[PDB]
Amino acid sequence: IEAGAADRVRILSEALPYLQQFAGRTVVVKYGGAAMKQEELKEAVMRDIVFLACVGMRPVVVHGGGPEINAWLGRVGIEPQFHNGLRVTDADTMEVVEMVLVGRVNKDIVSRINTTGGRAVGFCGTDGRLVLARPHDQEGIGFVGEVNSVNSEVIEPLLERGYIPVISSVAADENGQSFNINADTVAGEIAAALNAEKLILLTDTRGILEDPKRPESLIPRLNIPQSRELIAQGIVGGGMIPKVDCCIRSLAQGVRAAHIIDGRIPHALLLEIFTDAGIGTMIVGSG
Amino acid sequence: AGAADRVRILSEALPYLQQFAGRTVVVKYGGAAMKQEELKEAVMRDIVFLACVGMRPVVVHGGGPEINAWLGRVGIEPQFHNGLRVTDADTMEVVEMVLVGRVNKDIVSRINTTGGRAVGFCGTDGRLVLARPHDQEGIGFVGEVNSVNSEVIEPLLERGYIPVISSVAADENGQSFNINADTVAGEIAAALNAEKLILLTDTRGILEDPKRPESLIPRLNIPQSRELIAQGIVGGGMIPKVDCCIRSLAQGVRAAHIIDGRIPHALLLEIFTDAGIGTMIVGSGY
Amino acid sequence: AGAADRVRILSEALPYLQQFAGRTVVVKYGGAAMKQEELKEAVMRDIVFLACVGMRPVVVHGGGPEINAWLGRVGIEPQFHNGLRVTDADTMEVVEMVLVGRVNKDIVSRINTTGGRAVGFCGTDGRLVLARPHDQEGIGFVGEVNSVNSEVIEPLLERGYIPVISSVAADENGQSFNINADTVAGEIAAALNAEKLILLTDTRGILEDPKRPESLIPRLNIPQSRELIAQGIVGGGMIPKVDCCIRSLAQGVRAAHIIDGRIPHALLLEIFTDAGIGTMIVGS
Amino acid sequence: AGAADRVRILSEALPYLQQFAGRTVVVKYGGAAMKQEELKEAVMRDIVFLACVGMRPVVVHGGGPEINAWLGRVGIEPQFHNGLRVTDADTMEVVEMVLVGRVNKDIVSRINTTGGRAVGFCGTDGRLVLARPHDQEGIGFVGEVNSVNSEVIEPLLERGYIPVISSVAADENGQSFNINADTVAGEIAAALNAEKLILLTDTRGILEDPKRPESLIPRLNIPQSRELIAQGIVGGGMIPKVDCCIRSLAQGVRAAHIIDGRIPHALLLEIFTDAGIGTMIVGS
Amino acid sequence: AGAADRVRILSEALPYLQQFAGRTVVVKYGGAAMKQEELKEAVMRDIVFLACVGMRPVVVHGGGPEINAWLGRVGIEPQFHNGLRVTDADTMEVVEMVLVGRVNKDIVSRINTTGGRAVGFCGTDGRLVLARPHDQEGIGFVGEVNSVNSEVIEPLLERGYIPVISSVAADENGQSFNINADTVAGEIAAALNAEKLILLTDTRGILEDPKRPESLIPRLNIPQSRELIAQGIVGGGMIPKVDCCIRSLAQGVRAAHIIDGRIPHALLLEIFTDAGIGTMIVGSGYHEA
Amino acid sequence: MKKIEAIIRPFKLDEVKIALVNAGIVGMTVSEVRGFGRQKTERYRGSEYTVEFLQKLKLEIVVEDAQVDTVIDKIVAAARTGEIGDGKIFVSPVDQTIRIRTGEKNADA
Amino acid sequence: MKKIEAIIRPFKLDEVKIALVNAGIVGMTVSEVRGFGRQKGQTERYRGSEYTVEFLQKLKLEIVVEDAQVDTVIDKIVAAARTGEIGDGKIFVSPVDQTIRIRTGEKN
Amino acid sequence: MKKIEAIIRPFKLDEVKIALVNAGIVGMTVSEVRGFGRQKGQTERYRGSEYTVEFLQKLKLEIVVEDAQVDTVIDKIVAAARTGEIGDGKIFVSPVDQTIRIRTGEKNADA
Numbered sequence A: 001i002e003a004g005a006a007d008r009v010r011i012l013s014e015a016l017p018y019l020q021q022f023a024g025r026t027v028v029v030k031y032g033g034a035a036m037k038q039e040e041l042k043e044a045v046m047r048d049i050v051f052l053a054c055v056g057m058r059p060v061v062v063h064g065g066g067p068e069i070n071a072w073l074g075r076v077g078i079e080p081q082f083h084n085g086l087r088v089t090d091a092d093t094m095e096v097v098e099m100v101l102v103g104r105v106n107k108d109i110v111s112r113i114n115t116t117g118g119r120a121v122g123f124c125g126t127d128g129r130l131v132l133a134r135p136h137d138q139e140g141i142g143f144v145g146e147v148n149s150v151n152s153e154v155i156e157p158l159l160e161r162g163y164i165p166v167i168s169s170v171a172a173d174e175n176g177q178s179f180n181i182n183a184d185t186v187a188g189e190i191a192a193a194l195n196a197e198k199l200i201l202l203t204d205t206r207g208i209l210e211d212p213k214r215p216e217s218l219i220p221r222l223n224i225p226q227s228r229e230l231i232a233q234g235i236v237g238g239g240m241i242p243k244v245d246c247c248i249r250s251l252a253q254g255v256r257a258a259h260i261i262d263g264r265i266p267h268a269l270l271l272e273i274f275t276d277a278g279i280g281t282m283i284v285g286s287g
Numbered sequence B: 001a002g003a004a005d006r007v008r009i010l011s012e013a014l015p016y017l018q019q020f021a022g023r024t025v026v027v028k029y030g031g032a033a034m035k036q037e038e039l040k041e042a043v044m045r046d047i048v049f050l051a052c053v054g055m056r057p058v059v060v061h062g063g064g065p066e067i068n069a070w071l072g073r074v075g076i077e078p079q080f081h082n083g084l085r086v087t088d089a090d091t092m093e094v095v096e097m098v099l100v101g102r103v104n105k106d107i108v109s110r111i112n113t114t115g116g117r118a119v120g121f122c123g124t125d126g127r128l129v130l131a132r133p134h135d136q137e138g139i140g141f142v143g144e145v146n147s148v149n150s151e152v153i154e155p156l157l158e159r160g161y162i163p164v165i166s167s168v169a170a171d172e173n174g175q176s177f178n179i180n181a182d183t184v185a186g187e188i189a190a191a192l193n194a195e196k197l198i199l200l201t202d203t204r205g206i207l208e209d210p211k212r213p214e215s216l217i218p219r220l221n222i223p224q225s226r227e228l229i230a231q232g233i234v235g236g237g238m239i240p241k242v243d244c245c246i247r248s249l250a251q252g253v254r255a256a257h258i259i260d261g262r263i264p265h266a267l268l269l270e271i272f273t274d275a276g277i278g279t280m281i282v283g284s285g286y
Numbered sequence C, D: 001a002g003a004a005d006r007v008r009i010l011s012e013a014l015p016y017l018q019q020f021a022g023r024t025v026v027v028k029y030g031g032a033a034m035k036q037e038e039l040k041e042a043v044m045r046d047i048v049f050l051a052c053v054g055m056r057p058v059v060v061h062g063g064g065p066e067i068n069a070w071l072g073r074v075g076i077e078p079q080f081h082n083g084l085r086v087t088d089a090d091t092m093e094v095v096e097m098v099l100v101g102r103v104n105k106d107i108v109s110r111i112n113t114t115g116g117r118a119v120g121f122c123g124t125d126g127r128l129v130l131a132r133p134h135d136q137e138g139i140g141f142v143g144e145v146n147s148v149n150s151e152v153i154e155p156l157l158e159r160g161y162i163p164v165i166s167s168v169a170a171d172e173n174g175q176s177f178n179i180n181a182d183t184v185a186g187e188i189a190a191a192l193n194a195e196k197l198i199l200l201t202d203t204r205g206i207l208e209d210p211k212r213p214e215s216l217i218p219r220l221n222i223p224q225s226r227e228l229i230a231q232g233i234v235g236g237g238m239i240p241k242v243d244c245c246i247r248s249l250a251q252g253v254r255a256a257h258i259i260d261g262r263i264p265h266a267l268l269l270e271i272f273t274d275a276g277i278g279t280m281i282v283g284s
Numbered sequence E: 001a002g003a004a005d006r007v008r009i010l011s012e013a014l015p016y017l018q019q020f021a022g023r024t025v026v027v028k029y030g031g032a033a034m035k036q037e038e039l040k041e042a043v044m045r046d047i048v049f050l051a052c053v054g055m056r057p058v059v060v061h062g063g064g065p066e067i068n069a070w071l072g073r074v075g076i077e078p079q080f081h082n083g084l085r086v087t088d089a090d091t092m093e094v095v096e097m098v099l100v101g102r103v104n105k106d107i108v109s110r111i112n113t114t115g116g117r118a119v120g121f122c123g124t125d126g127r128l129v130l131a132r133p134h135d136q137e138g139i140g141f142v143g144e145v146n147s148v149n150s151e152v153i154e155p156l157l158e159r160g161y162i163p164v165i166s167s168v169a170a171d172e173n174g175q176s177f178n179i180n181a182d183t184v185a186g187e188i189a190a191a192l193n194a195e196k197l198i199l200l201t202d203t204r205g206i207l208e209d210p211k212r213p214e215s216l217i218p219r220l221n222i223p224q225s226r227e228l229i230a231q232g233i234v235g236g237g238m239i240p241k242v243d244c245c246i247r248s249l250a251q252g253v254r255a256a257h258i259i260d261g262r263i264p265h266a267l268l269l270e271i272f273t274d275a276g277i278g279t280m281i282v283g284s285g286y287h288e289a
Numbered sequence F: 001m002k003k004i005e006a007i008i009r010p011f012k013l014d015e016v017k018i019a020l021v022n023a024g025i026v027g028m029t030v031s032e033v034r035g036f037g038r039q040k041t042e043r044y045r046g047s048e049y050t051v052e053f054l055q056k057l058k059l060e061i062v063v064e065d066a067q068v069d070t071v072i073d074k075i076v077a078a079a080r081t082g083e084i085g086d087g088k089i090f091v092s093p094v095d096q097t098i099r100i101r102t103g104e105k106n107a108d109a
Numbered sequence G: 001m002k003k004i005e006a007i008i009r010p011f012k013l014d015e016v017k018i019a020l021v022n023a024g025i026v027g028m029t030v031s032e033v034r035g036f037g038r039q040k041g042q043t044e045r046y047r048g049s050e051y052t053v054e055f056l057q058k059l060k061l062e063i064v065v066e067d068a069q070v071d072t073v074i075d076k077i078v079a080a081a082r083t084g085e086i087g088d089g090k091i092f093v094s095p096v097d098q099t100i101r102i103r104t105g106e107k108n
Numbered sequence H: 001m002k003k004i005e006a007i008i009r010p011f012k013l014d015e016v017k018i019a020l021v022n023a024g025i026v027g028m029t030v031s032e033v034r035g036f037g038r039q040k041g042q043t044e045r046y047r048g049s050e051y052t053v054e055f056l057q058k059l060k061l062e063i064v065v066e067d068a069q070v071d072t073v074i075d076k077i078v079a080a081a082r083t084g085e086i087g088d089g090k091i092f093v094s095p096v097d098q099t100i101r102i103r104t105g106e107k108n109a110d111a
């Protein structure tokens, strides 16, 4: 007997163990692909990030934005070019990359978090030398960078005070030249720097499948040697290789867990953190 | 794929989580919520939830029924005058042992195993509450709150602990006094400048027409509450509860809630839902 | 022994160093100082100097010319109504990309390589500046400063970082707005309770007689500034600059300077010399 | 329309200011720098400059000549065993009064009026320096530094004060001892883990050939310095100075400078110029 | 058994220890307390005791007799104009050397070896005291306290050190001035918002009838003190001491004590006993009419 | 022309302000104040007090003679809790009012 | 009916309060204030320092009283707050038209 | 005899004080105050932000003066405190019956 309607409450109460498990922990999310393209997914990502902060965790958003860049390159008469995964980026292209990622996309994210009620602060690597860039090993592709160093001093106090850093993947040379860095690898390095509990890559895939020709042979949990074996067996292929490499490289530096998850589904973040639903593969440095 | 959407019931909770971020909530835990196992477990889970989610719950409690049981075991007969327990020297000793020793540690213990970090006090610990004798005379060592000093518990609150406070407090000379738990809860709230005082009660809240259940008044202010008392609409043991709310609101507590502790998860229902589990009384309206 | 000296000059700077110890200085960096390479390099060296010597520089900037160049590259036409840029949805997107993305990071980058530690914001970062639509209508997404929240930048200032702030800020609902950089600089100054607001300008300061370029007024107060406006002695695009100074001074900024950004090391010349590179306006 | 363009010079000082930002510099002030009015005024100006510009100057001093004057006024004859002052009970009383009471407060006083904030200690204040008797017997109350406790001065340094330390320190039982000011300076430097120890000296530095004015050795390391001693190229009263530098470097002070205090602004010349006012000895 | 109801005494001190927990006490150390060895040792032990037990002692001192001895050794003849020392350029130099150099470090030194941690200043250190010339002209470099800045010693106090302050302070241009140590003690007390100012003196306190002890007045307030001056009951060199107390009380110091430094452990006797070693003056104004 | 000082409970500020603005009241100052107004005890942050000073707010408005009664009613209604410590209102004469930026004057009673 | 404002030395609050309560004075407010009052080319001592024209921390004490009570209340304040040193403060007396208790509505 | 209360912009204190002292004004108190003077259609700027109806930090300056001095004191305050921007403040003039110096007892009930 006898009143009331929603029990949001029982579900709320059931979230306790998960809330308890990651209290105060740092979570670095690489936001891109479909989660960034489609409006519904994008709104949910912003709501989940705000949720995480509000509930006592420390979300960090890292992003790039290939499609958005392509659109602007088109508007200026430049034709998009790629060399095995990485964007071929000349002086002219680099200017646009910078303007799009730092100026437009970054402030779209900060802006949305702000109106959802979080307090977001947008950086690129060059702000406070958060990320120092060096040229990527791959020659002949212009100003594509590798992360030479990360200095988290600029964002740590902000994190302690409850702000949500939103970090674009562009970073300056030690001489001031901007470089285009792959956002996954920036996310992994920030995670390593922050000694993060989780690195989460929002991805256009279901995770890692053991058999591609068998939709949900989804591998829930892998460790490093196991991941290596999958690469060597070609089970992990194409554009999944750099993603796995990025996870391994981050885990080896002490990040507790790396998640390659399906950003194509609404609320992917909350689904990963607070559910046992199979939205992706966790890769760990342990067991 | 996938089965539970706990997730979107989670996402919908956001505005409520945002609304009370960092805010202090003083809950007076008693009655059915304390008697039945089902409700007791939920109360502990709710308190732990509030802390975990960034709010600052404070539990205040008494335990009339548990006292009665012990008095019976020692050959003392329970006695009451107008709501308050007639407590002589002998009775006071038992009251103290039950409330401070047994009931308090049951609450602290349960929060601890639920994964919170509770610390149990009574008024005499760090002079949290200084007692003076109650105005009603001939009822023995029944106390009124003479002063509250929150210095002992706020650093603990800042650090995320859950204070659990029993309603017993010492005289300035060391004599224990039995204080009504509602009024202790109200004064702690006032001291902490709390966002909410919430009384877990054995009633639906305040009914406008006591003969009709649907007449539950969701929101009242002070003059309105006074007007209900004067009209006899608020009566019996609801009067001291309303008085305690008014007294607390006047000292700057933002809102007081008289809610139905007989229902599982009453706390979460009040904080995070628009369900009618009680009456909110505010110092500003209507 | 002994070549340059170089030390006497250094020793003579003491009273100026002493005078502004720990003080906050908000510099609006624009016009020629931003266009020409020599001046630009000197501005960055001066900002780094101020920090390094114990003061608290804050750089605020816009960048009209560099916006124009990009608008051109995308087939959009530059358009202005009485000083303010007419900025539609499409234009606003480019304004944002240029100011926040390109110009802001050029400044941050250069300070960094000069040896300072710069951090670049726009109004929307941490809600540093909340925008509202400008009173002037039919000019699109031109903003006014609705509120400033300095909480995001002062711990950074405490720690010795140089905030570099672009004049773009979001609406309460997330819509970007284009705000005039002088007015942003004035409001940041007011928020920070700054010692000085300095506008780097393409003029000598305020002249008593426009035909007589040696007629520079070194010091003015508010009522005096108002009289000059009313007499037409201050005119054209000098009016909004003076208004911005007055508005800032009334909120408690100690002094406002309209100085000549066309001259190398304008900043140091103002702070550490008695050279006439501009007009100081004070609240007394 | 410029004039005293002190500004290029000021801008050029940036790399030096950057290089020693926040660093601690312990200066032993004595000799001609302390005797002549012009030099003295410049020393005080340079110390105040260093603090004001973000560094952490510490002044350590003795004052042999001043002591001699007072001993004369009281009918005591000055006496020296090789380098060190022969100081009996009576002499020690005067040494204390002169160094702690007169000379120390002259320095503190002048820094204060130049706009710094100086605080004067001797070793006995807060047990900054605990004295033990010097190894050399028969010379009375000459001390060595037994221990240094920097706890008393480092909060003061953190708050921007300029400690001025006289070289007198008490025994563990309360007896004052006279310590050589170079060695006190070196030990304070070691305690503070100082960036530099600078000795203001009545010499050009260390000459590679005492009779070649431009033979000034600009930079030495420890084994090199040892070699110069063993070859007699460093002799007389330069030996203890070099020893004191070596002793200090071995404890972790980055660089020790023996410089010409006879020249105005010696301090700034060393820190902010590449002029040859002395020899730097390093632990590298 | 004992010999050990040393405890009973220790336990009885409790209320006094409770009363002044954490409080600041500025003691002007001079006269016989400073001359005789037994009294001197006890003063240093009492100061160390106060700190160790949680209070915050500050020692302020001059040293007229010591100065006289040194003036003599240099061929200078001591000279006074009604209380204040006539101090020319030459005399000023010696005053400085004696008070700052010799006497101050004797105090600091002794506290240190008794197990406290003393730090010695004069007014010029950190501009603790800024001097201006005294109103009385023709007496050379005698100063008045122009300002006090306690920023230099506050943190030291917070950290449990015992400041020992000599009464010499510089002009704003750098010239040393000789200030009366009572008045320096009173102004430091005011600056520190001290609980007590205590003057160690060569008198029993204030006697009601001076040609008869002990008409010792235990407690006075301001109007009452003024009354005693106007009636001549407080006279001679007691006037400036009372003036200094009044001046300090009016600035918010809770109580001023003129006590007998001639008796061993005068300080503890005052703080922890109800013994009559002096007169307490408080800032109230109750005198009847 | 009259000055109205109302000593009020701090939490009541916003409610009283809203009532006054709605009654057409334009200018207003608040200051922090401690007070006691004792009939027989007052509660404050949980404690009982008799004669000690308790944190309250002093709200000051200047108003036309004719507006006085309704402004009082408005304040009383907005600030009352019915518990001891509710505060007091004082009415006193004002001769003249000057706006600093315009120089504009005013004289009523 | 009169308002009495007394600017006083902060440490004097308790003594003045006690004098007023004993004189039968019931309601009272204090606020923190800075002031300067002095002449005639003569200095106020505050926290050890000399001041001429700068604002020094004082307390403003306000009471409302019956016309007949004014003189004895003044005497009472003067006697309780006086030290005789510069900086003792001032008392101002001004008219009050009306008094209203907020909880009862009772006019005076 | 009149009391003059001036609500002013905090930074203006020193300039107003100097103007008053020079006008021969002797005694003076300041207190910290929050205020709003809300001319509708118009917001006040304070530390960068726009405000309509919220309380903003100001200073309350109080002097007691002779009837004859009132007009020139007002002029002096107005001239010293004005910026021309909204938020400049207000001056109130009210009667004072009597003045007593605490240390001397000297009462001013001017004629």
Ligand SMILES: CC(=O)N[C@@H](CCC(=O)O)C(=O)O
Binding pocket: A032, A063, A064, A065, A066, A069, A085, A086, A087, A097, A144, A145, A169, A180, A181, A182, A183, A184
């Ligand atoms: C080097 C490189 O390819 N950078 C990416 C950045 C975008 C992202 O990582 O999402 C690019 O498209 O230019």
Ligand SMILES: CC(=O)N[C@@H](CCC(=O)O)C(=O)O
Binding pocket: B030, B061, B062, B063, B064, B065, B067, B083, B084, B085, B095, B142, B143, B167, B178, B179, B180, B181, B182
């Ligand atoms: C005085 C009094 O009646 N105390 C209550 C305490 C329990 C409660 O109120 O919850 C009692 O039962 O003794």
Ligand SMILES: CC(=O)N[C@@H](CCC(=O)O)C(=O)O
Binding pocket: C030, C061, C062, C063, C064, C065, C067, C083, C084, C085, C095, C142, C143, C167, C178, C179, C180, C181, C182
């Ligand atoms: C509104 C407006 O015109 N903004 C400027 C940018 C900032 C500035 O240059 O001051 C513009 O040129 O678009």
Ligand SMILES: CC(=O)N[C@@H](CCC(=O)O)C(=O)O
Binding pocket: D030, D061, D062, D063, D064, D067, D083, D084, D085, D095, D142, D143, D167, D178, D179, D180, D181, D182
């Ligand atoms: C021991 C000794 O000779 N001390 C030095 C004082 C300190 C110094 O100047 O080095 C002296 O001449 O007495």
Ligand SMILES: CC(=O)N[C@@H](CCC(=O)O)C(=O)O
Binding pocket: E030, E061, E062, E063, E064, E065, E067, E083, E084, E085, E095, E142, E143, E167, E178, E179, E180, E181, E182
């Ligand atoms: C001015 C003056 O008389 N100074 C004192 C020293 C300080 C003191 O002992 O009071 C003196 O005898 O010279």
Ligand SMILES: [Cl-]
Binding pocket: F037, F083, F084, F085, F086, F087, G103
């Ligand atoms: Cl009341």
Ligand SMILES: [Cl-]
Binding pocket: G037, G038, G085, G086, G087, G088, G089, H103
């Ligand atoms: Cl006076």
Ligand SMILES: [Cl-]
Binding pocket: F101, H037, H085, H086, H087, H088, H089
């Ligand atoms: Cl206005």
Ligand code: NA
Binding pocket: A271, A272, A273, A274, A275, A276, A277
């Ligand atoms: Na999971």
Ligand code: NA
Binding pocket: B269, B270, B271, B272, B273, B274, B275
């Ligand atoms: Na609800």
Ligand code: NA
Binding pocket: C269, C270, C271, C272, C273, C274, C275
């Ligand atoms: Na200048």
Ligand code: NA
Binding pocket: D269, D270, D271, D272, D273, D274, D275
């Ligand atoms: Na050099």
Ligand code: NA
Binding pocket: E269, E270, E271, E272, E273, E274, E275
């Ligand atoms: Na005593």
